[PDB]
Amino acid sequence: SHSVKIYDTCIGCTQCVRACPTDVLEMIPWGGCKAKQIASAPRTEDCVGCKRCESACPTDFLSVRVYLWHETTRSMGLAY
């Protein structure tokens, strides 16, 4: 299972959650930004590691990060 971490520079634009192809991410309420929103990653046992979320984040530097880690059946994307 890969690791996905959210950092407090997040502006809560939700662009990363819209992009995930396996539904790893989620929005949760917060108080540190104008959107009162922050991303979370509750379901990292399904993450294929495509970094489609990182291409979508606009902050500099990134607010979502994907660290590739130990591989499994779901992580490798095997249908057999």
């Binding site: 591989e71 499994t72 490798m76």
Partner: protein
């Protein structure tokens, strides 16, 4: 654990063929193994050094033994400029007869290889003259490998 490789638990739970490949190519990177200490790393490296030393002695043992056994040294010492030094013999069952005839040179009684490492010149330069010196050296190197 409970599977190859033992040093990595993350690779051992990999159900694809990757597990085998990466198992081999991570075996000497001691700092990346599960439950690694400073003492375990240093002691592993020390023992590994000793293994490499044994390897080197066994290899030079092999060279000495083989030119003393299947070699050309004695005739080479009599005329260094007009004889080709032998490395070892050829035994290959896929050989045909003309190749058998083609590779039989240096005065040998069958197919051989000519050496280009330069060990005849080096050993001749430092003192070894007859096959018993080469046998002696090979046995001593075997001993040092074991030690």
């Amino acid at each position: 654990a409970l599977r190859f490789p033992r040093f990595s638990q993350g690779l051992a739970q990999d159900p694809t063929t990757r597990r085998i490949w990466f198992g081999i190519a991570t075996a000497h990177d001691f700092e990346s193994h599960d439950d690694i200490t400073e003492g375990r790393l240093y002691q592993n490296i020390f023992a590994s050094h000793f293994g490499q030393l044994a390897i080197i002695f066994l290899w030079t043992s092999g060279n000495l033994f083989h030119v003393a056994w299947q070699g050309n040294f004695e005739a080479w010492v009599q005329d260094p400029l007009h004889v080709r030094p032998i490395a070892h013999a050829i035994w290959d069952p896929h050989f045909g007869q003309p190749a058998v005839e083609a590779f039989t040179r240096g005065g040998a009684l069958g197919p051989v290889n000519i050496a280009y490492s330069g060990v005849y010149q080096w050993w001749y330069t430092i003192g070894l003259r007859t096959n018993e010196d080469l046998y002696t050296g090979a046995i001593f190197l075997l001993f040092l490998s074991f030690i």
